[PDB]
Amino acid sequence: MIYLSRLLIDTGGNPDRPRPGRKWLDNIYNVHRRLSMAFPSGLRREQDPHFLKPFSPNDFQKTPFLFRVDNNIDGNDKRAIIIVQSVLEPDWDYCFQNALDFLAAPPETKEYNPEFKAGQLLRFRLRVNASVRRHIPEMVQQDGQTIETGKILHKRVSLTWDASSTPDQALADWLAAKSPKLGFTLQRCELLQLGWVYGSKPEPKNVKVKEQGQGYWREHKYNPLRFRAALLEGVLEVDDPKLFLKTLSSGIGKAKSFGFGLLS
Amino acid sequence: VMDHAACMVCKAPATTVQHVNYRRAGGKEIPEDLRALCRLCADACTMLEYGSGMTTNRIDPCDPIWRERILAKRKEIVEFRSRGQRF
Amino acid sequence: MLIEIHMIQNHSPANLNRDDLGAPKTCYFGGVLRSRISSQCIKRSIRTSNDFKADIALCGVEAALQVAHAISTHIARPEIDYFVAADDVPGEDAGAGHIGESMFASACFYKYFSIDWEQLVKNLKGDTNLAAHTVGAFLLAAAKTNPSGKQNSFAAHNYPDGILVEFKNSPISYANAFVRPVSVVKESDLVEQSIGQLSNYVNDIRLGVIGFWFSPNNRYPLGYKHSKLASRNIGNLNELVGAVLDYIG
Amino acid sequence: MLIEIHMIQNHSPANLNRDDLGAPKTCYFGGVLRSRISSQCIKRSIRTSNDFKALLGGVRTRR
Amino acid sequence: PSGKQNSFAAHNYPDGILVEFKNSPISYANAFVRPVSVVKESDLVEQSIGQLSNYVNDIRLGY
Amino acid sequence: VAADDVPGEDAGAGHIGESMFASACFYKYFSIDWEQLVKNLKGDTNLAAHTVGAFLLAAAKTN
Amino acid sequence: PSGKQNSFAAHNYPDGILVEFKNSPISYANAFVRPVSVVKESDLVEQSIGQLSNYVNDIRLGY
Amino acid sequence: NRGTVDFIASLENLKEGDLGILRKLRGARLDEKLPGFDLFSALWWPLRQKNQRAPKREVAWLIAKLFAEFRFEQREGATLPILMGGICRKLEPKKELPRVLARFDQLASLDIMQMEEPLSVIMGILRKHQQVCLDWVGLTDVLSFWEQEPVKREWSDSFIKAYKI
RNA sequence: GUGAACCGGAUUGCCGUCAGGAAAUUAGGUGCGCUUAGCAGUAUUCCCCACGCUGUGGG
Ligand SMILES: [Mg+2]
């Protein structure tokens, strides 16, 4: 059930006027938030059509889904493309119903269903994290005299590849070896984009107390999160049209919420 | 962070807090009257408040009767704001 | 025990009390001239009509009432009129009537009432609960029918807005609230400014009983604080009547 | 039994009533100046109205 | 009223009638003790009717 | 701005300020009375024709 | 103009020149009241020169 | 006061375009145009954090609009009922003096917002009589307290005092 | 309860009836915003269940 579509956003052209979409694209936590309060619910849909209510994420349906932000030229106009697909029907008449400045052209819903059988030459790109659990999380190197104090911490650090090669034949080897698990293969792979992606997620806490109830009085906190990016393509030959559909429903890698998803 | 670092009318990352029900302008404020709300639509709240009567009744961007004016003022804020000329 | 019906009463433009020459009557208080209706006029207006008679022990042992002259909360503003009675039959010229002059004033008033313990019990008539029944009639019968006057040409029967009833036994009129006549500032009403002056006087004098307060649908609060200067910011017709009834007995 | 009839009329720029000097009538209601139309003028205009002609049966004359 | 209607033909009609049957009449002058200052929305007739209806509310519940 | 060219001091400019302008598509109306003009010139027909023709030319060709 | 030319280098010389000599001033900016839209067969300089020639022939013949 | 003087001095600093957009906003509230509100915020915000006393907001907006429209200069001792009255002595008492006098008395029974047009006609006849100086600070602090009758009667008695001399 | 009691200044009224504020006006001339810039990067990526310890469910 592919629901591939597009959300063409309004990049500005004057960094003097306020630019809502450009600022919104700089934080992937809020990018996921924006993409996730779409298709909200039918629970309180009959109450209000105006999106004027105190926000709570519990009312929104907790179905995991996917997106990816990219850039393309159609024939004559640069416009950043967001490609989404989900198991629920598209209803972007409420997510952007008072934030029309976020959009450039009204979004379009397509219908698509896959068929590849085995060994064709009609495949597409991919996005993934270069995340590996560390072999040697060496004992928490602390500061003060550039020393080492701690014991251990299993962390999902960035992939430390080799030092005598480039990653268009190192990460290429990596997903070429990864492909027979997920039910496909790579005969050619050249990377297009790599780097880091950043965000910020807020943590509600509780320190203070209230004299007539429980501790409503409390403070704020923010925390950062980082990921290693890899956008790349390939001419691929699917092993079987019976297990690759699960990979087309989950994606190579499972950042999902934070951009890196399935093959497109 | 009660509203999860977000706006309320035009949901987006939030900066400041607006004040509704000016029974008291606030030295001691109860947490069920304020309105954490982003920069542009709080500027539109100041649009609507500074024009016309100042009074003690406030905007309350929850009941949808003060909606079209807020969005229109935000549109002219987007179109006509000079950041280099402050604010 | 003593009943003080401190009452505010705005009036649409009309003359109610007339002197020899027809002017609205005036008093002197606070170093200014303020409009006045005579206590005899309003006291007879409390009598002489059957809506209140629904009371001869109270305005006759003599009688049982202290009705004050209606001191305006602001300065007097007497205006003048000019009427022409037409001829309505075509003569060689036009105009026929007395071509006289009338005169009127619009004012917001105040008064004070006094009914003591034995002054209501020895009033008696025939019962001992009559000493609560007649008073219960009075607390809103005093604000039932504006007197009389030139109503057939100046129709004014504006009902009062803010009514106090106190159970303090020491007889003191709150006229010293209106030592300074009430000026008007754009954000508040004249009646609202007068009621703020009355509230500001109420927060005094207690430094050196209760406040039973009437505001219809509580549009006028006695003080813009949670520490209410009356603590009884309620009122609806005979609810206050029955509450005074079981306050007395 | 008595009947009340209330109206709220907005009027074009007009002078429906004047005093001896020609000013429109004014009253100090509520501490501010309010424009006034005399009651006798309304009574006279309703007396001389084009629908009272079946009932107009009073004369106020010295001749 | 047949004032200067030849010079100010203000023949506008009453935008409100309130007929109420009772044995104790009332003028809604205290509905406009607060002067009616118009806002950008609505008009003078609607704001006056709004203040009148507010007064009708608290003299139909409070009084 | 107004920029200086002599380097008598640090790299200043001089006088700064603003200008305001616009661009538009304009509509212009004229009306030349004929017998009133010929009464004003007292019977000079050819000078009146000169007036009307030169006005028709000068309204168009001049800005 | 030598503004920000160290980073852009736009030293683009001329496409066409209209030098005239007449007795009354005219501006063919009104030729481009219609904006020049690119057709897939010609470049915008040729298109703009065509629009300019259209309006120049208009003013030369109609005045 | 030591707060309104800074407001008037900052108003005198305003350049031609700013008071042009203030001129275009006559009779219009500070909401329907974004640049007008931005200018008013820039003029009105920073004087509350430096001195404890500031004028009322509506008085500041109205005075800014009128100042842009007329462009006088600030001079102590040149309030409205002195120059007014001084020009009333230069009149024929028969006909024109009641006209201009009623034009002046119209101000004494009006609220702050509606005085834009009567103040406009008063300052128009002031401009016709070639008046350059006007005490903007004095006008502003008699206008921010215009709702108390002592200052209105003092202003009127100043007109009387300037008329009898 | 006290030179004080208890106590209306009451009713009848159209200010009405005639009125162009009209003749005349270039908003005027002066002006550069401008000097400096890789959107890149492996050797801790903030986490939580979670692997023979780097694949695996997401914030
Ligand atoms: Mg907002």
The answer to whether B10 and B73 have CB atoms below 8 angstroms apart is no
On chain C, the residues whose CB falls within 8 A of the CB of D28 are 13, 77, 79, 105-106
Cα–Cα distance for residue pair A32/A25, rounded to 1 Å: 10
Nucleotide nearest the Cα atom of C48 (by C1') = I8
From the DSSP assignment, how many helices (H) and strands (E) are in chain D?
A: 1, 3
Nucleotide nearest the Cα atom of F2 (by C1') = I31
On chain E, the residues whose CB falls within 8 A of the CB of B72 are none
The answer to whether B48 and B68 have CB atoms below 8 angstroms apart is no
| Residue bearing tokens 């932000």 | A69
H runs (alpha helix) in chain A: 20-24, 28-36, 171-182, 244-250
Q: Hey, of C35, C73, C81, C197, which one would you mutate to test binding to chain D, going by the most D CBs within 10 A of its CB?
A: C81
CA of B10 to the centre of ligand 1 (A): 4
Q: Is residue A100 exposed (0-12), middle (13-18) or buried (19+ Cβ within 10 Å)?
A: middle
Cα–Cα distance for residue pair A147/H89, rounded to 1 Å: 93
β-pair type (C7-9, B16-19): unpaired
Per the rule left: phi > 0, alpha: psi between -120 and 50, beta: everything else, A246 is: alpha
Cα–Cα distance for residue pair H14/D51, rounded to 1 Å: 65
Give me the CA C86–C1' I16 separation in Å, rounded.
Answer: 10
Q: Is residue C234 exposed (0-12), middle (13-18) or buried (19+ Cβ within 10 Å)?
A: middle
Judged by CB atoms closer than 8 Å, whether chains meet at C13 and D38 is answered as no
Binding residue ranges of B for Zn(2+): 10, 38, 41
Binding residue ranges of B for Mg(2+): 10, 38, 41
Experimental method: cryo-EM
Backbone angles phi, psi at C69, to 5 degrees: -65, 140
CA distance C185 to chain H (A): 5
Judged by CB atoms closer than 8 Å, whether chains meet at B13 and A17 is answered as no
Q: Hey, of E55, E56, E58, E60, which one would you mutate to test binding to chain C, going by the most C CBs within 10 A of its CB?
A: E58
Backbone angles phi, psi at A222, to 5 degrees: -120, 150
- Element holding E47 (H helix, E strand): helix E44-60
| Residue bearing tokens 């100086």 | H133
Beta-bridge mates of residue D38: none
For H14, the closest chain F residue by CA position comes to F17
CB atoms within 10 A of CB B6: 21
Give me the CA C21–C1' I10 separation in Å, rounded.
Answer: 13
CB atoms within 10 A of CB B32: 7
Contacts of C28 (CB under 8 A, 6+ apart): C34
Cα–Cα distance for residue pair H10/H60, rounded to 1 Å: 12
Cα–Cα distance for residue pair H97/H91, rounded to 1 Å: 6
Please tell me whether residue C193 adopts helix, strand or coil conformation: helix
Nucleotide nearest the Cα atom of C147 (by C1') = I8
Q: Which of C210, C119, C124, C204 lies closest to C165 in space, CA to CA?
A: C210
Helix, strand, coil percent content, chain B, rounded in steps of 5 = 30, 10, 60
Cα–Cα distance for residue pair B61/B8, rounded to 1 Å: 8
CA C122 to chain centre: 26
Please tell me whether residue C25 adopts helix, strand or coil conformation: strand
Q: How far is CA E55 from CA A100, B57, B76, E19, E26, in A?
A: 42, 20, 39, 15, 11
Judged by CB atoms closer than 8 Å, whether chains meet at B13 and A54 is answered as no
Cα three-residue angle H124-H129-H130, rounded to 5 degrees? 95
The answer to whether C16 and D39 have CB atoms below 8 angstroms apart is no
Strand order in the sheet with C7-9: C109-111, C7-9, C163-165, C212-214, C233-234
Q: Which of A198, A173, A171, A8 lies closest to A84 in space, CA to CA?
A: A8
Whole-angstrom Cα Rg for chain G: 15
Please tell me whether residue B77 adopts helix, strand or coil conformation: helix
Please tell me whether residue E30 adopts helix, strand or coil conformation: helix
Cα–Cα distance for residue pair D40/C152, rounded to 1 Å: 10
Q: How far is CA B49 from CA A228, C36, E50, in A?
A: 46, 43, 22
Give resolution in angstroms.
2.9
Give me the CA A129–C1' I56 separation in Å, rounded.
Answer: 14
Contacts of C7 (CB under 8 A, 6+ apart): C109, C110, C111, C113, C142, C143, C160, C162, C163, C164
Chains that touch G (3 or more CB pairs under 8 A): F
Cα–Cα distance for residue pair A71/A13, rounded to 1 Å: 16
Q: Which of B36, B39, B28, B26 lies closest to B62 in space, CA to CA?
A: B36
- CA neighbours closer than 13 Å in the CB half-sphere of residue E26: 21
Give the type of residue at A28. Answer: I
Residue environment code for H134-148, b if the CB has 16+ CB neighbours within 10 A, otherwise e: bbbbbbbbbbbebee
Contacts of C226 (CB under 8 A, 6+ apart): none
Start-to-end CA distance of chain G, whole Å, equals: 35
Q: Which of C225, C160, C179 lies closest to C32 in space, CA to CA?
A: C179
Cα–Cα distance for residue pair D49/D56, rounded to 1 Å: 9
Cα–Cα distance for residue pair A230/A171, rounded to 1 Å: 9
Cα–Cα distance for residue pair H101/H121, rounded to 1 Å: 12
CA of B12 to the centre of ligand 1 (A): 7
Helix, strand, coil percent content, chain C, rounded in steps of 5 = 25, 15, 60
Dihedral, CA atoms, C57, C59, C65, C71, nearest 10 degrees?
A: 160
CB atoms within 10 A of CB E5: 14
Give me the CA H38–C1' I25 separation in Å, rounded.
Answer: 38
Q: Hey, of B76, B77, B79, which one would you mutate to test binding to chain H, going by the most H CBs within 10 A of its CB?
A: B76
- CA neighbours closer than 13 Å in the CB half-sphere of residue B49: 19
Chains that touch H (3 or more CB pairs under 8 A): B, C, E, F
Tokens of B12: 């987006």
DSSP-assigned letters across all residues of F9-60: SSS--EE------------------SHHHHHHTTS-HHHHHHHHHHHHHHHH
Q: Which of A53, A46, E40 lies closest to B61 in space, CA to CA?
A: A53
Residue environment code for A135-166, b if the CB has 16+ CB neighbours within 10 A, otherwise e: eeeeeeeeeeeeeeeeeeeeeebebeeeeeee
Cα–Cα distance for residue pair A235/A120, rounded to 1 Å: 8
**Stretch 41-70 of chain B: residues touching chain E, C-beta under 8 Å:** 52-53
Give me the CA A232–C1' I55 separation in Å, rounded.
Answer: 21
Binding residue ranges of B: 10, 38, 41
Beta-bridge mates of residue A84: A67
Nucleotide nearest the Cα atom of A163 (by C1') = I42
Tokens of D49: 């109205």
Per the rule left: phi > 0, alpha: psi between -120 and 50, beta: everything else, F45 is: alpha
The answer to whether B40 and B77 have CB atoms below 8 angstroms apart is yes
Chains that touch F (3 or more CB pairs under 8 A): G, H
On chain D, the residues whose CB falls within 8 A of the CB of E25 are 2, 4
Please tell me whether residue C192 adopts helix, strand or coil conformation: helix
The answer to whether C239 and C133 have CB atoms below 8 angstroms apart is no
Q: Contacts from C198-201 at CB under 8 Å and sequence distance 24+?
A: C198/C6, C198/C8, C198/C162, C198/C164, C198/C174, C198/C222, C199/C223, C199/C229, C201/C174, C201/C176, C201/C177
